[PDB]
Amino acid sequence: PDSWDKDVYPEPPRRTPAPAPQTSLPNPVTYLTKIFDLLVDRPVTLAREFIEQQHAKNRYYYYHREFRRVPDITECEEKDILCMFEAEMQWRRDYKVDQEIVNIIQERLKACQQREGESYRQNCAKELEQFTQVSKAFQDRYSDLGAHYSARKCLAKQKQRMLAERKAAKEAAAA
Amino acid sequence: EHGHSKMELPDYKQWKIEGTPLETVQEKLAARGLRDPWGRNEAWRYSGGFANNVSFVGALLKGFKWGFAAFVVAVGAEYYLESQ
Amino acid sequence: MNPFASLTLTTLTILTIPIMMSNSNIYKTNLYPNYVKTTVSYAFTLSLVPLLMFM
Amino acid sequence: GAHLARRYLGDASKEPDPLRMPTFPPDYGFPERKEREMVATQQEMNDAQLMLQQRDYCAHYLIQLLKCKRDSFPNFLACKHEQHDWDYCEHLDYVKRMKEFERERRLLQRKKRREQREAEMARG
Amino acid sequence: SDAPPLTLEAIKDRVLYVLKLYDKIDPEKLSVNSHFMKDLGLDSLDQVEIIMAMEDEFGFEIPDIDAEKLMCPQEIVDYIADKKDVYE
Amino acid sequence: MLKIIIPTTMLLPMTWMSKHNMIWINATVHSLLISLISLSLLNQLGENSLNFSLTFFSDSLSAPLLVLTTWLLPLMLMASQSHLSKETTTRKKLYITMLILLQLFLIMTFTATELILFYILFEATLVPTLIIITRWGNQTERLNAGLYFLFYTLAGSLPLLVALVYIQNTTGSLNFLIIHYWSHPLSNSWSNIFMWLACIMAFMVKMPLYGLHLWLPKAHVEAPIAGSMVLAAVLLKLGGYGMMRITTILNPLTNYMAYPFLMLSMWGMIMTSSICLRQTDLKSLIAYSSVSHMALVIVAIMIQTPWSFMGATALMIAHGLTSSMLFCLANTNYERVHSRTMILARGLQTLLPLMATWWLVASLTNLALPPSINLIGELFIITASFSWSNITIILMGMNMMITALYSLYMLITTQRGKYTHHINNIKPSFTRENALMALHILPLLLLTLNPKMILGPLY
Amino acid sequence: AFSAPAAYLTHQQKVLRLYKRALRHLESWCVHRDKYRYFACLMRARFDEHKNEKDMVKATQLLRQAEEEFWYGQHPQPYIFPESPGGTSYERYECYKVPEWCLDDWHPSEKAMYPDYFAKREQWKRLRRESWEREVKQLQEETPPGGPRTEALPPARKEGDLPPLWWHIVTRPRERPM
Amino acid sequence: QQERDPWYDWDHPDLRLNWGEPIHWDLDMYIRNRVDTSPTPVSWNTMCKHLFGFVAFMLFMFWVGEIYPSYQPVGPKQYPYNDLYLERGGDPTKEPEPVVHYEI
Amino acid sequence: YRHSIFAVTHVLIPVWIIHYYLKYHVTAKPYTVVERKPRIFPGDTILETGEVIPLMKEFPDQH
Amino acid sequence: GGVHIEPRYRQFPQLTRSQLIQAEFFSATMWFWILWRFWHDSDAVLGHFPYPDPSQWTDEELGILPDDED
Amino acid sequence: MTLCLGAITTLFTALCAITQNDIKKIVAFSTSSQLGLMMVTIGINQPHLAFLHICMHAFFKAMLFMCSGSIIHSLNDEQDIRKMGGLYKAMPFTTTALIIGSLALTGMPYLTGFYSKDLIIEAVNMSYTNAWALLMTLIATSLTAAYSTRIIFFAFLGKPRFPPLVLINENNPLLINSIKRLLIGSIFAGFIISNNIPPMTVPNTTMPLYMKMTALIVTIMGFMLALELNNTTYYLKFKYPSQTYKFSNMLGYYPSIMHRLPTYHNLSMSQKSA
Amino acid sequence: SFPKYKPSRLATLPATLDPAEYDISPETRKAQAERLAIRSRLKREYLLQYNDPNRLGVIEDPALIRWTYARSANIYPNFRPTPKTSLLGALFGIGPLFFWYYVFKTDRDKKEKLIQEGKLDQTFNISY
């Protein structure tokens, strides 16, 4: 459906086999599904068309909010409270966005595991690796901040991690 | 609608120890000089339709005669039908 | 569309209707147990369809 | 089973342990050493997505059995032939496994006899 | 349940039935007001087995502190009717 | 925020100038209206807060507690309506005045942008509760209870005040926003240890901590029904709100310092849940159950993780509602039997069936049956504690088992079996009591539909 | 249950209790009727060997060896009637037993239904009111001084009197109210 | 309280108590819904010894059965494509050691 | 008649409501309903594309 | 929703003809199904495939040399 | 762990059932033993077989308890089997339903219990499991047959033992239809479902002839030995039980100790130290 | 002879196996008589306060009040510091706390060491 982008949540082409009746016996499934269609699907579809034309009679729109980029906590004075407040709000919005990103990737993983059935262990390694990478990044960013998390605490964690990284790189180069 | 039909109890002279294993119990008791005071009381459990008991294998084999006749009819019919 | 979902949710959904009618007047009559039994039997014969589809 | 009795109550090294079998090279017995044959390919059997444990050498009969099961649905007793063929293929696999077990046992017994003969020759 | 509403006549009839079946008592000498120790010359153990017969008969057991002091069929029927809340 | 405070203040004029027979109706109607007004604060943001002014701010931790505080007053009025029938209009008006003062003080306490103002209102909440317990209490030990319920708090509260003023001399501000944004690590020193203890102990005593929980059974047993409701529902949550607000400055010293309180809470939840099994009194039993639940909340606050805080907030709200309902049921029993012991009035289900249904629902929701918010908070705290250490699951499971055991024991002893024969003065339940229980229970099952409303700012 | 126990149990009472218990447990042992009758008659013959023993010390030595033997051979799962204190329906219907005074709390719209019953109940209440003020004096005069010695109650002795403390024993709900 | 006489007309039939009689300090522990001290046909120590012995014997025999496994006389199951390497875990960019199964 | 009214008031209205809600609200969002990707066996043809999966390796058939 | 059947007091209880024939119908049907299933697949209960004797296999098919080659 | 727990559970519960007099208690212990068997099936890594056993166990155990309930209602809420004698002719439909259900529960060829039962024993015998669990499972099957023949023998074959006032009746359409629906299920559902579902596991197509027949031989031995033991009750001889019967009757003494020792030591502490 | 039944705390002596009951004396009979006399005065008082039409309330029970007051409010005024009481209180209120502290501190020390050395494998550990 057009309601959601197909690229963000990709799906295989969903090939389906053909009916190959090997006997002359009338299977109950086809007659059952046809009586189901006649008794259920037609009234619901007609009601939906009525509802949709009533909707088209009165049309209004809503717009997604956009936010301007603001100096972060690295571009913040040690005590200038206005810039720190702006940076904190920006950091919290980024935190929510990253949470939604992990939500999307987890949804991808669950959908692949359910869809590919018995061959989930092989036919969904791409989604598993993607989730592993995004989870590693998210853990690196926000794993240990705890309650009362703040942009300054995340910055300190990052600074310590890059200190470790540069020390390890210098040691390996000079090994 | 309840069970109000004025049921009447049978005659107490009908229940006799004779014909029941309680006769054997009385014989074993008199072999020591003893007699059961309550022998006639329970004898109804051996008198009526409960006098005839059925064995374990007979109980398990409840409907084998009819089922066996049905099976033999069915296999004969199938043998006479497939041989065509 | 694919009556599997509709049937498999309708079974559980109609399993709860007598619970909704537990406050109605039929709960104060002697016909409630028959109502529940008929509802559960209908639920079973309705759930028989997704079993056939899976089969 | 008698193997349990003959192992737990007899000689430990006389009979193998199923966890580590085989412990000898395949072509140790004879040098022809034919290799086991396949009918199902990766794509068609992944499409089959039977089960991981059912993905054995008897897979083709399973695919045909599941065919027979899906096409002639209301007559759930139509294709009794494919069930028989799949059961036979699993029979064959099991007897080949039993033959491998007996093979290992007699190879180990022969090696033990050869070692005992070597010890007797050394002592002599 | 489907239990018929047993009445006093049924209780007395059944008690006299059990009393008549017992051999140690001649059926023509017993009565509703027939005593057990003196009218009939029955032992205390005989009274306790009469209590046992009644307990088997009616499907409930009488407490022994009530059982040991029941000596007539009429008072026994009265006790059992009081226990079972019998109208008439 | 004044749109809630001002009507609450105007309730005083409304009650004192009311007709001598129309005090209850007017108070109930206007309290329900004030609750409707206070519902507006639930629309929180994922951003900082609702900073109304320099003096008051609201938060998704403050908003649910504020709504519960506003909602409890009509229930307290309806519950107290019965046993105040033989009192002069002056004394009933004084009672309602104390109730309105308590609600006003709680409302001002839960916003409290500044820490000293928070402390002042948080300590002012003591006086009307003390007066209610000591004056409209039945037994002779109520005075003693009051003294306890006072001095504990004051002994806990005085160092906090000192700590507070000291902080303002070093940091320069005690506003929550500046404190959060300018927070600095606390070096591991003796002076910082004593600062931590002074800041924490005042709220720890009110929770109550397992060691310091002596006052709660006395106060609950001696208080009238309104006092028990307000003490179980809101007055225990002040410690949780205070710890949640104040732990921001205490890092990183919290990790080292928290071990004694964590051990005390984890063992004391088991200890009081077991104490509940052998209790001859309803109010004492529910008091010990409240101690167990608040000990779990203490563990959640001390762990200091997002899931911990969310579970603690949900559990605080759920326990407040459930404990208020249970105390209402117990008081319904007392006003009929005048004994306040479990074993005397028995087999009441045969005689009061709908009240038996209310008892069953309250017992189930105290038992933390899913998907009620009680279980939501319980499970969030349990998961956070498991992440903290994998051994905690044993204690949590034991607590859950004993909780189910004592809840069903309290249901069994009172509702099932055979009635006491000599009791005869038990009248069929009034519409007032049934409406009280319904208004207690329906919000819980409505809130389980929207848990995110009560999961706090870390949602 | 109806009659009040005594200050003790005599030797004959104890021997009768043991005889009853032993026969019941033996019946639980011998499921079939003929086997039970045979072994019960053997039991009674063993019991009646010592009916004429006169030594109080020998009598005490007896029935005690019997009790210890019975405890050894007591059929750890005896048969119990359903309504006995060990039965499967001992207190099934105690949930259906409601008191009498609950009818005093019925709504007048409910009391409009069943008017004859409540008229008769009013007559019963008046009877109880008069009979109680009679029974108080009757019991106060009849009781031994210093308190009663046995918890058995005297019957009524005049014409218009009723048994002392009669209301709550006559007005039991039922054995099976519903 | 379970072993109190079940035929006496107590003032409280379920609790089996009389009005003015003294109440045991641990009555709430003995309420016929909780731990009881009723006489049992087999002595307590015999019961404990028998139950402990049965449990210990079962545990030890299960351990011994773990020590001696029961198995059919057949080799391990043989799977076609490198012991099913590509669809058990995956990792197709490694090319593991190939395995050829024996014909017999 | 009783069964006729029961079959519409207790079976038909619920399936109508549930099918509407599933087809037009639940399925609107992604991944809400996920199927099994039905089994494909050699020799079948796919309606969407029309191709036929090639047959197998003609194993020796005996017994 | 049944018929009126009175208590008997020490005689055989009254028995309905409909119940007796039906009980026998179902028992006979069960036995007939068991026999039919036995007849239809006699081999299956016994087992589809014979079990080989591992001592009856010759050394040639197992790859055995006469103890001196290897 | 799952395998060992299931084996010990099924053995202990069948052994407890083997001496019980109340009908509901013995059927409940049979249900517990069946659940232990299902756990053993899970432990041998056969989940689909365990699910199939769930499906068939539901049918035949529900019909067993339904027959028991009809029996108890007919005898004025009497549950002990010592006061129940000849009901084979006094009430025939419940007799045939219970005999079918007992045959099915034990497991027989071409019976609903057979598919679950035959396969379970087949798989556990043909798997790398514990020898002790195997042995306890076989003894559990033996005890299953033994308690089935115990209940049928003591409730349907001997002379009647109920109070003389006969209120035996069955002519009620609800009971008959409800019992016969589950009867049809317990005769046909096993075959239909087993031949209807797709295959999900490797079968044990090859087997030694004696090892294929172990289930039938053990059920026949259980039947015969238990029948011969119960037949000796008619003899006019009385001896005092042994310790084994006392152990089996009091449920391994587990409900005694574990319902008096922990509770007390908890409750006391909750008043004294706490 | 038969093997002796041994009474225990949780499986008490049967009523019919007490050696004390068979040692009968006139003093014992007087004791039982006065016991039943006390029981009968209690029962008579209860029934007199019970069957009165005027009474419409709870029959207050002195025994229950004594039970509750002794359980709750009589403990501390009768308490005395004894070596047994002090040792028992110290043990049961102090030992468990230090035991659990030791367990949790050791576990967290091991976890932190595993963290610092880097071999804990916290992949997918996102919620804490």
Ligand SMILES: CCCCCCCCCCCCCCCCC[C@@H](O)O[C@H](CO[C@H](O)CCCCCCCCCCCCCCC)COP(=O)(O)OCC[N+](C)(C)C
């Ligand atoms: C008696 C016998 C039964 C008869 C009645 C039968 C009918 C039963 C139906 C009732 C419940 C059954 C479940 C059906 C649920 C449908 C309603 C539900 O879906 O709506 C919820 C909505 O309910 C509310 O969220 C929960 C109410 C919160 C309660 C607040 C407390 C009330 C104030 C009282 C004072 C506060 C005291 C406590 C302080 C905290 C969740 O909505 P949501 O899926 O998300 O999104 C709605 C659509 N959007 C996207 C456009 C927004």
Ligand SMILES: CCCCCCCCCCCCCCCCC[C@@H](O)O[C@H](CO[C@H](O)CCCCCCCCCCCCCCC)COP(=O)(O)OCC[N+](C)(C)C
């Ligand atoms: C009664 C119900 C509960 C009430 C409240 C109980 C909770 C409060 C208890 C407070 C816990 C301990 C307080 C201080 C903790 C500091 C850490 C200490 O335990 O560890 C060692 C501390 O060493 C010794 O323990 C020194 C303290 C010894 C003196 C304290 C008295 C101990 C028992 C008294 C307990 C009584 C509490 C209540 C009194 C009214 C580590 O040695 P060291 O590295 O060198 O010091 C580190 C701290 N530095 C960095 C500032 C230097």
Ligand SMILES: CCCCCCCC/C=C\CCCCCCCC(=O)O[C@H](COC(=O)CCCCCCC/C=C/CCCCCCCC)COP(=O)(O)OCCN
């Ligand atoms: C429930 C009732 C419990 C009451 C709470 C008891 C625990 C509270 C701790 C005792 C009171 C201390 C209040 C301190 C207020 C904070 C001020 C502060 O932290 O500043 C420190 C001051 O720290 C102190 O002075 C602490 C001294 C405490 C003296 C009185 C202590 C009372 C008894 C202590 C024993 C009990 C301690 C633990 C008890 C736990 C609760 C029982 C730095 O001092 P400066 O000189 O300005 O720094 C410059 C050099 N860097």
Ligand SMILES: CCCCCCCCCCCC(=O)SCCNC(=O)CCNC(=O)[C@H](O)C(C)(C)COP(=O)(O)O
């Ligand atoms: C399966 C359970 C087995 C239990 C076995 C227990 C052992 C049984 C063996 C008992 C041995 C005895 O007789 S122990 C003998 C005890 N001593 C006496 O009996 C002396 C005088 N007997 C009486 O006074 C009685 O009351 C009497 C006259 C009988 C009746 O009295 P009544 O006129 O008022 O009916």
